[PDB]
Design a protein around this ligand. Sequence first.
Ligand SMILES: [Cl-]
Lengths: 370, 360
Amino acid sequence: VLSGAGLRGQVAGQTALSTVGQEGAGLTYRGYDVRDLAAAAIFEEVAYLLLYGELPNKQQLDAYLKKLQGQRDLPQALKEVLERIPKDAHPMDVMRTGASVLGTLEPELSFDQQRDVADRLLAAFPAIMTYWYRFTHEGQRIDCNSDEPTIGGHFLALLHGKKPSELHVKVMNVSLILYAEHEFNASTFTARVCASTLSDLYSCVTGAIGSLRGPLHGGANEAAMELIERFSSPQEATAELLKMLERKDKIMGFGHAIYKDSDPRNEVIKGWSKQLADEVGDKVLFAVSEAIDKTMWEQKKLFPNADFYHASAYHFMGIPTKLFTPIFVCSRTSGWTAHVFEQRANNRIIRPSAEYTGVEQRAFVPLEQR
Amino acid sequence: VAGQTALSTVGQEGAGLTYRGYDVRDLAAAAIFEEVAYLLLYGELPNKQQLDAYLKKLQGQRDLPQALKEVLERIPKDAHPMDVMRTGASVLGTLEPELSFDQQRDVADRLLAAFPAIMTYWYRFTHEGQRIDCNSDEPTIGGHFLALLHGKKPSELHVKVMNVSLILYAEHEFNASTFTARVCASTLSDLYSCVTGAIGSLRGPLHGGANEAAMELIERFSSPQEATAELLKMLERKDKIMGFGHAIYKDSDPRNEVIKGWSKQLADEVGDKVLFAVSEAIDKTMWEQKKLFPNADFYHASAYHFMGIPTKLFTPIFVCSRTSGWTAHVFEQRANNRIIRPSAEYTGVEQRAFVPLEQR
Ligand SMILES: [Cl-]
């Protein structure tokens, strides 16, 4: 074990995009409290804030909506590629492959195009995900356009093939805002390391997706879903959690490496998951989640992080569990691409060295003398 | 000091580049690339039985699945060849997934055996209108690549120099692409993701492409006298000379001395009268004028050109070689891991009140 393992606390670069765990608002995007943005904005306002630098006025926002709405369809060649990705593929590999292939079809030929490419990814990723999913799981080639004006509603229209409820559109917008940006985590760092070699925007995103695929980084809301779905009463969940804690099982969705007393994103999504539970008539899943939440506080003094109540919220909107991390990609692409533009404008980055722990120099031995 | 490695040392006393203690110069002289890939992935040089078994294994992993061939056919002719390599690795991860780290060395072997066909199947389909057989009669990866690229049995000399090149580029400690592979590995992601990410970082012109830029320099000149005259002009303007110097090596890049001699042999075999002489004039002038040595990339440009390799496939060849080092680095990260999560210095605005849409 090396003292500098993981680069914990070592400055790898500079950012104006966000601050996590600082005094005042626990999470800000260009100085705005994420809880304010999630309550009062659509995700396009927040993507615009990250990528273009300021909250848009009504005419900037309308223009941006129109632009994204014209960028939702997939090229024919990309549809043909997604049809050949197996049904049992990891959905994050589908996202990774879609980004990789789109980079060959619509290349970033100059960094002048970088915001057009980021906007294209934000507009097309919901179709990359759902065109593959419904082709392989339902045997249907879907329309990649929809009548929904926002990314969040468009995703639900593609997934379910019907007009989403206004509550469901709202909570999708809330979720995409909540996950949009989180400073220098593993996938944002991967995107910036790639950006530092002056590689193209599709490479940076494809790299970031691969890092988010690892279970120490992505998939915590899927793990929370796999816990809460086990129980048919909140009292069964409590009794079983008490046994898991005695075994020192790690309970995903609880605690945080940076937040000290609460994750600002939790209070937001918890409230919206409660509204969804009431709308859809749920009598078990939200109550199960609350009981686990209460038991984790009483036994371990751990608060729920952003991943815990996202599990139930997505489930109430009909979203298959294996599409949760792909939804995170649709959101966090805004922060990732914004971090790439910062790296390109101010290309300063840490260059780590290694400590050699191998063998001393040794003479070469010929093949037959081995 | 991000991490620890046992794979290689660069610029230390004695042999300037070692792989698990072995001087890269002795490996490139005496081994085929598969012996060095085995050293990096399995930990020691293989014996005759082990090498024969490894070659038979890799020979049965060269073909591409039909779904992958169909995907490669949809990548445009004018695509960046590194995006073809990135896409091929990504798609192969959905067809033959790494479902447990127990499979890690098998997946690394599959990528080493399949990368040559991913590159050439795409290339020959889009540039020569042909769907090629992805198997060949060549026993080695280096020969197999040339057999697929040109559709003919390569000469013994060309097979040798391909093997030398794959060995020389196989591993180089920490750098942008190896680091990217390790950051990805640190989240416990799968092996295909770590290689896809590393390819993306190598695509950036501050990391990848130096041997292509060297090619674009040496191809300009019709004679060594002209090259010398123009180089002294560039040196007066303090132009950067592609293929010279190194951030670590002090007096010589050990890989340069090896590939220079193999380039010289290729130039003789193909009857070159200009490219090697031009390269040597630039080499000699750089030492006289600047006491700068050529690094690995400089004579690799002529060697690959004499083997009939299009310039835009040079970095893809580096991917076929450096996949050995990348995957070996991922195994080290997995065996002794902490998620890599650095800090940022915040330079943005102070916290501020939300402004509603109508007041913006
Ligand atoms: Cl666009």
